[PDB]
Design a protein around this ligand. Structure first.
Ligand SMILES: Oc1cccc(-c2ccccc2)c1O
Ligand SMILES: Oc1cccc(-c2ccccc2)c1O
Ligand SMILES: Oc1cccc(-c2ccccc2)c1O
Ligand SMILES: Oc1cccc(-c2ccccc2)c1O
Ligand SMILES: Oc1cccc(-c2ccccc2)c1O
Ligand SMILES: Oc1cccc(-c2ccccc2)c1O
Ligand SMILES: Oc1cccc(-c2ccccc2)c1O
Ligand SMILES: Oc1cccc(-c2ccccc2)c1O
Ligand SMILES: Oc1cccc(-c2ccccc2)c1O
Ligand SMILES: Oc1cccc(-c2ccccc2)c1O
Ligand SMILES: Oc1cccc(-c2ccccc2)c1O
Ligand SMILES: Oc1cccc(-c2ccccc2)c1O
Ligand SMILES: Oc1cccc(-c2ccccc2)c1O
Ligand SMILES: Oc1cccc(-c2ccccc2)c1O
Ligand SMILES: Oc1cccc(-c2ccccc2)c1O
Ligand SMILES: [Fe+2]
Ligand SMILES: [Fe+2]
Ligand SMILES: [Fe+2]
Ligand SMILES: [Fe+2]
Ligand SMILES: [Fe+2]
Ligand SMILES: [Mg+2]
Ligand SMILES: [Mg+2]
Ligand SMILES: [Mg+2]
Ligand SMILES: [Mg+2]
Ligand SMILES: [Mg+2]
Lengths: 298, 298, 298, 298, 298
């Protein structure tokens, strides 16, 4: 009984109009606006939505929504969290319906990141994904969930304890030499075939969210997205490259919210056997600075 | 009875030392030096060599070596060329041994590019390919030959006539809008599964050779090669991108000889059904100029 | 309309008893003795036989039996041979029944090797192969015929002309440096998926037959056969090794007749694209001399 | 929670220069020298290293490094060892960094063989394996670890108890008749798909290490390695052959340290169903003596 | 921890000479005679033997040998039997060596059938199976063990209890209408992929053994065996047919011992979901009577 994917996430923004154009044109996400005054939705697949975009916001993460298989796993995981001393709240029907899920609980991770556990997402099988721009392919979701995030943590061991309790596996996978003779350690945790769904280190961070990674089925879509960022003169924090752990081809670019999007292609299957690396396979060179990723990876 | 691959090529250079370091470090080719005063060899696979590098040169193409299956196809193709009015010379044993082939004929294509037809290459099965730097993978050769070239032509129809006679198929595949309201037409011809092995247009060219394309089995090797060009501050004429015909991910970078190398990955199978395009899938943006590829492809 | 396999061969021996023990114990062939005063048979598969062993012999080849698909190909190939000036004889029923074939013609190759062309071999489907010793596996026959032979030739070009007319393809595949500064050229020809079925050079030879190659399905059988030759102190002319053309693991050992047997495993598919080599992949070192294979291959 | 592969090993040598030439030329291993005064590394794959070669040594094993999946399995296995009465030491960070692992513990097996248990090896994905000589293929590592060793034991039952506790399975697989009417019993244990990773008997042994087996992906590399040993007149203790348990084609040759290397090809998958044999499939005949393997296997 | 196959069986006979000719000629088994005064062996595969044939016998079963995976399963199953009140004896080394196994225990089933449990059979990988007559194929053994037996039982529920404890699964699969208005119930139990390895009912039986089933890989071998029984005028108790449970094509014929052999082909995989039938798919008509199988199956 455990978390099985990153199901949805909630973000808040100061400029919904910018975000709509960004999501559709720069990424190929689908905008779904249900006429609600304070929010709209982004789709990737048959799910009613993967991302909720709240208005009047802080340009940061609002919540991560972690899926469990069904009510039995929901109830068991709640009691597990309670038993280990974590503070959780089981939500009422109104709150569950807000997220469009059958069961919902709210807590916060050890870093203060608002964390939701749910079962029973709404799937709109009648409404196939229709991307915000023409795409050669689609997104990799399914058993691997929407993507992955790096979020702020103040205590890596406590964060690891919490995510392990949720059913994640993983540990330190990068030891990065720093220009001070020190080492930066990044830990990466998986809960399904996606090489990682959550990752973190002890680094001071101005925002809850460092970056969100979204994966294309097709290299042609990743390339065109890269071209869109360049044509539109959008900051690329780390250039195209291949991480040693997940082995995806990715780059990192600015969002209208100032945290990074990592569009990518060809992520490898998660492994339970822990390894570490001291650098990337190639690329991911620093280009734009001021984003929390001034580290040497190749 | 026809040409079946680009088997070898000969180039001449002014700086053999630069070329050795370039081939090994920037590309991962193997240098084989047989102690000959005026030449060395580059390997890609079990062939004794794919490229002959002659010293004291012109920094351009010396010859293209087109393979036929055996002596019967050799003899039939010679008589075909003679019958259609082309000037060929069947080489003696000494000349054949120079190229390390069992049978050899020399002619020139309609653009003045020295052209060789041969059967029976020397394979050193005892000496497996050992790349000039560590590689994740290897090169795509085999049935597809060493790679592809764009070479100078003065008359596209005459060039097409000549290569069709050799057993190639293909025609105009790109019509590129030019800043003058004119169109540039590029023709691409295949003789095996490699999407193309020879290509050309009517464009004035300072050299016989515009570019040579070499294909990696592994994207990781292409990325690292791209990183090598950037770290070494080598001119990139056209940035990373995907052509609409061959669908390979490639970039074009300078050689010590001033003509371009196109390192690449994931070329599609040649098709006999002619199509045309007016642009690339993404990328291949102009970066360095002065190389004969100032055209808008995306 | 062409030759499709080496179907059977006839040999003559001075010591049938030695040959029986040799075939069964050292090789795992099946001895079938039909009570004929002057001959016995060796089986490899469901064929009534692959090898006829005649008594009172010369310890050399008596005939090679080349199969065509049926009577139409038989009649067409006969007329082809006649038309090109070769002397053939179409055999009567008694002669055909001697070889246990439906149609039979006799001629000699340009080297004086008695050569038979036939259609319609006798298959004893009721009598499955039962090897002369326990085997892990069986023999590779089927579409590839019984194996391959190197036979004496006095004129390589004439031999090539003759076998090409029979439907074989191939040419010079080895150029072997000799301790005299000279080169030995060996030509290898295929008529099916077996990398070669006949091979030859211009070398003076005391016998029609240099060696016969037989292929095991299982490496374990080849190893045990190698062990049998060693335990029985049988001459090994060339030690274990891998030829660059066929890529089989083989060794060459003496027969009671003084010509060599080449037991082997893992032969590659024949290719129509001619290549040449100047040495083997590894091994095939000279051990026993006096056998016509004192050449340096690794 | 258990050992999952032989991850690394440490050896000490009197002649590092000999070992470098041996590793590269005779075996095709990669030498990696990090400029440390007292040691260098041998690579087989993307791991930073598989073998540590310490200078100023005893020409024997220094340690075997057994990998577990992650920290949870590490902690559970430590407590398991403690609970069963074994003496272990959990290493500090400096000691862990020495081995380039995330967690490290040291103990000794019942035979006095220094034994390490670790999680989190360093993988240099940026630095693909580059063999010390040209290779047709590569090494079999991955889920099967670096290879297998036979090490000295004084009490087979105690050794079995210890390795079973570490998660290995296996028992007596060979009962070898001895020229004294006695029987030699060898036990073989697996911890993954490699047929065995550790093996032993009660035999008096002058060294900790009897032999190390390394596996090639390609038979052509094994043959060429065999040829290298012969050309360089290196002692072969047991000739080419196929063991009945693992079914690999192997030979055993001397190292500069006097213990044996067993280069091999085509190892079968480990089975949990115990069988025994009284001899090999073929070969492995004694050639050079004085190495602890004077036993009759075929 | 459980029984995993019928590994060997022991029978005793009054006429060893008849049995040798029967095994080889009528069935294609291999006779292996180790020069022991009182016994010989029958082989089916790489096992030293599957059947021990004791002389001076009773023309009935002597023992069934049930394999477990290794010593741990051996020790656990012994204690399980003891704990449930069964009488077992763990054998000494001399007794274990008699059966050529690493560990051995003896007991009797609830019907008085001597029952052995063992681990570690002797495999003669060096001595491939060599059938007693030419065969098109071989036997189905491997994970499915040697075959299956129906043995006498006096209490079906007690027999079921005992075999369930050994790790078998299965129950009543046939309810056969009898000419008395009664029903015969036969129970069939599996311990691997073989549809059943042991089967029984409450029927009075003059012998321990009703029949032994042996399976050919090839239908051609089953047909030829059927032809051998007919040509030699050997009693066929039940004619060719297909049972509804195992779905093999089989017949039942007399042995020199008077109990039946069931040669067969194409047995289906065992299923854990219990079904029953009231008749066969076709055939298995009574021919010879006096054998304990006078029941109507089609
Ligand atoms: O420990 C784990 C915890 C959660 C999920 C996985 C997983 C990994 C790959 C594919 C499917 C599931 C896992 O290994
Ligand atoms: O998906 C990923 C895989 C490996 C490393 C990172 C990473 C890069 C820079 C800073 C923090 C993490 C990552 O995002
Ligand atoms: O503030 C911003 C920061 C980064 C990107 C955009 C953007 C939005 C839509 C389309 C293109 C770029 C933006 O507005
Ligand atoms: O017209 C043609 C001429 C020469 C080669 C090909 C070919 C294309 C793809 C794969 C193999 C051969 C071809 O189509
Ligand atoms: O391989 C290729 C595929 C498609 C186009 C080109 C090309 C690009 C620029 C100028 C000329 C040709 C090419 O090289
Ligand atoms: O003139 C030149 C032009 C382009 C590249 C190189 C180069 C050669 C070796 C290594 C790196 C770059 C060079 O010398
Ligand atoms: O030219 C040829 C003549 C005769 C047979 C083949 C052949 C080769 C491989 C597989 C099947 C037939 C062939 O190529
Ligand atoms: O099958 C074969 C493949 C390649 C070469 C030979 C050969 C070796 C020595 C002398 C003549 C031929 C051969 O038999
Ligand atoms: O003259 C001979 C030459 C070579 C081998 C044998 C031989 C025959 C049977 C069994 C073993 C060896 C032989 O007799
Ligand atoms: O008992 C065992 C203990 C450890 C590993 C294996 C294993 C065997 C084959 C393939 C994968 C794992 C095993 O069976
Ligand atoms: O890998 C192996 C498999 C089977 C036996 C041995 C062995 C041979 C001689 C002495 C000790 C063990 C071995 O190494
Ligand atoms: O003492 C030694 C024992 C065995 C082999 C070597 C050796 C080392 C390098 C290259 C070839 C052989 C050696 O030096
Ligand atoms: O309950 C069972 C007990 C023993 C074996 C099996 C089994 C059946 C089919 C294939 C493999 C094992 C089984 O199902
Ligand atoms: O394998 C088998 C499958 C189904 C039934 C029987 C059987 C037939 C007659 C009497 C007793 C059992 C059998 O042997
Ligand atoms: O008593 C007997 C009963 C049944 C069969 C045989 C027999 C033995 C060998 C060959 C053929 C039949 C026999 O002897
Ligand atoms: Fe990421
Ligand atoms: Fe190109
Ligand atoms: Fe040969
Ligand atoms: Fe070994
Ligand atoms: Fe049965
Ligand atoms: Mg991971
Ligand atoms: Mg084309
Ligand atoms: Mg050939
Ligand atoms: Mg084992
Ligand atoms: Mg059943």
């Amino acid at each position: 009984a455990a978390v099985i994917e990153l199901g949805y996430m909630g973000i808040s923004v100061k400029d919904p109009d910018a975000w709509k154009s960004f999501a559709t044109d720069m990424l190929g996400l689908q905008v779904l606006d249900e006429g609600e005054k304070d929010r709209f939705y982004l789709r990737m697949d048959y799910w009613h939505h993967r991302i909720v975009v709240h208005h009047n916001g802080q340009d940061d993460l609002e919540y991560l929504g972690w899926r469990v298989a069904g009510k039995p796993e929901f109830e068991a995981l709640g009691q597990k969290l309670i038993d280990a001393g974590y503070k959780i709240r089981i939500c009422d029907k109104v709150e569950a319906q807000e997220r469009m899920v059958l069961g919902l609980m709210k807590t916060e991770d050890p870093g203060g990141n608002p964390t939701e556990i749910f079962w029973g997402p709404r799937i709109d099988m009648s409404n196939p994904f229709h991307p915000g721009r023409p795409l050669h392919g689609k997104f990799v979701t399914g058993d691997q969930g929407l993507g992955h995030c790096i979020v702020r943590q103040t205590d890596v061991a406590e964060a690891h304890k919490f995510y392990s309790l949720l059913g994640f596996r993983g540990d330190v996978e990068y030891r990065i030499p720093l220009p001070n003779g020190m080492t930066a350690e990044l830990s990466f945790m998986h809960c399904n075939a996606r090489d990682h769904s959550i990752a973190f280190g002890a680094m001071p961070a101005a925002k809850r969210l460092n970056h969100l990674m979204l994966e294309y089925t097709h290299m042609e879509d990743l390339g065109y997205t890269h071209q869109q960022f360049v044509k539109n003169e959008i900051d690329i924090a780390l250039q195209l490259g291949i991480h040693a752990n997940d082995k995806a081809l990715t780059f990192y670019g600015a969002t209208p919210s100032g945290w990074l999007i990592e569009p990518g292609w060809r992520g490898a299957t998660a492994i339970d056997e822990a390894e570490y690396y001291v650098g990337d396979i190639f690329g991911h060179g620093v280009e734009a600075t001021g984003y929390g990723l001034d580290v040497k990876l190749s």
